[PDB]
Amino acid sequence: FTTQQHVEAPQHQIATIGYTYIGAPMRSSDRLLNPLGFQVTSYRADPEIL
Amino acid sequence: IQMNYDTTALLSAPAVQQDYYKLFRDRVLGNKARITVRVRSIQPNGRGQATVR
Numbered sequence A: 001f002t003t004q005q006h007v008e009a010p011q012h013q014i015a016t017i018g019y020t021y022i023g024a025p026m027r028s029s030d031r032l033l034n035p036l037g038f039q040v041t042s043y044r045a046d047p048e049i050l
Numbered sequence B: 001i002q003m004n005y006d007t008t009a010l011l012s013a014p015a016v017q018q019d020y021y022k023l024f025r026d027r028v029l030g031n032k033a034r035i036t037v038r039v040r041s042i043q044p045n046g047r048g049q050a051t052v053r
Helices: B002-010 B014-021
Strands: A011-021 A038-047 B042-044 B050-052
Touching: A038 B042, B002 B014
Parallel strands: none
Antiparallel strands: A011 A038, B042 B050
């Protein structure tokens, strides 16, 4: 993916995502955002060297 | 290459040093062709482990 600040030159980055799913949540405020239960268990993102 | 060769060995476990030594490139590239290498990005991922692009 890429990212930019508003304009500064855009940067390139790569994320590594460890993940699972915890099933449907049991609150209206959660199910209307993440019904599938997606969950990141590990996350890192480093600059891409072009 | 003599410095890069010795440096690589200096920064390698004997198992790794042997893998490296075996690559000798001295006849294929010799003094007819050369290899240029540049690293774009390195990101560590754990306990003695990293990814180099």
